[PDB]
Each structure stands twice: as C-alpha cells, then as structure tokens.
Amino acid sequence: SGAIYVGNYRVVNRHLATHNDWANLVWEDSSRDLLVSSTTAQGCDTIARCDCQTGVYYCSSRRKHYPVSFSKPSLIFVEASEYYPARYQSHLMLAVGHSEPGDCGGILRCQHGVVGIVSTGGNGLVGFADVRDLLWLDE
Ligand SMILES: COc1ccc(CC(=O)N2CCC[C@H](C(N)=O)C2)c(OC)c1
Ligand SMILES: [Zn+2]
C-alpha cells in the first residue's frame, strides 16, 4: 500500500484504488497501473522532474529503504494477475531489489523528489510506475 500526495491530488496504484478514489477520479491509465484522485487537503509531497536512474525506495515487506539503479521508463511485459490480463505495462522502470505483492505503493525518490511508486515485482526484481512525466500534478 501507499500513495503520493501532491497539491490537490492523490496518486495510487490503479489496482489498489478505493471506492472514494474512483468517486473523485481525475485520471487513470490501466496500461500504467496508475490512478489519480482529487483531495480536499493540500498534499505533503514534491515530484522529481529529472532523468535520474538511481534513487531509494521504501519496501514495506522489510520495513526498510533500499538504494536502487533502475531502467528508464519503458514498455515491459507483465504476467497475468487477479487484477489484469497478461499485457505490456508502459512507463515502467525495473531494478534489482526485494518486493512482494503488498509492497505496491512504496515510493521511489531521488535527490529531486518523488520519481514513482512500486507497481510490480519478481524473483529479486522490483518495478516502479514512473510519475515524472505527469507535469499537470504541479498545477
Ligand atoms: C515476488 O515478488 C512479487 C510478486 C508479485 C507481485 C505482484 C505483481 O507484480 N503484480 C500484481 C498486482 C498488479 C501488478 C501490475 N502492475 O500489473 C502485477 C509483486 O509486486 C510488487 C512482487
Ligand atoms: Zn532526480
């Protein structure tokens, strides 16, 4: 679990969005596993606007942060789950690191701010949904 709170927006994994997120929908994209809802309170977070390929993510299944080197946002095949059929997920960044299904929503940050959120995992891999291209989150 986890979310990004920036301005009057809440960014969550689309597959973990609540009834309230859908009732206050701003934008969603199944191919990216992202959903953004509107909030009444002003949010706590800054979005990175950079090309960093290193950063630190929070891993809930270890209660720890880990440093990672990650690939640039790209189209990656993701196996079928209870949430989606087998498909290519876009704007996904992979890194070697620990992840379990409940780790989705953990934030990845660099020195410039929030880069993205955990969205996939595998045997010693962790995948992050990028948010740096969503310029409208800042206005
Ligand atoms: C072994 O580590 C795992 C195993 C399985 C997963 C879960 C996973 O990847 N998905 C299930 C939820 C929707 C995801 C999507 N973006 O399509 C895909 C994991 O997530 C962090 C770590
Ligand atoms: Zn950066």
Q: Which domain holds residue 88?
A: 45-139
Tell me how crowded residue 85 is: count the other CB atoms within 10 A of its CB: 9
Q: Mention every residue, 6+ apart, whose C-beta is less than 8 A from residue 71.
A: 53, 93, 94, 95
90 lies in the same domain as 104: yes
| Residues 18, 72 within the same domain | no
> Measuring CA to CA, how many Å separate 51 from each of 41, 55, 95?
30, 11, 15
Judged by its nearest atom, the ligand closest to the C-alpha of residue 60 is 1
Q: Are residues 104 and 129 in the same domain?
A: yes
Q: 15 with 34, same domain?
A: yes
Residues 106 and 139 in one domain: yes
DSSP state of 62: T
**For residue 19, how far is its CA from the centre of ligand 1 (angstroms)?**
21
- Residue 1 in tokens: 């679990």
Active-site residues, by number, are: 15, 33, 104
Instruction: Look at the chain and report how many structural domains it folds into.
Output: 2
Same structural domain, 20 and 84: no
CA atoms of 17 and 86, how far apart (whole Å): 20
Task: Kindly state whether residues 15 and 71 are assigned to the same domain.
Answer: no
CA distance 104 to 91: 15
Instruction: Mark whether 36 and 103 lie in a shared domain.
Output: no
Could you give the 3-state DSSP secondary structure of residue 137?
helix
User: How many whole angstroms from 16 Cα to the centroid of ligand 1?
Assistant: 12
Determine if residue 59 is labeled as part of a ligand binding site.
no
82 and 35 part of one domain: no
Question: What's the CA dihedral at 14, 114, 68, 96 to 10 degrees?
Answer: 10
Whether 32 and 11 map to the same domain: the answer is yes
Three-state DSSP at 139 gives coil
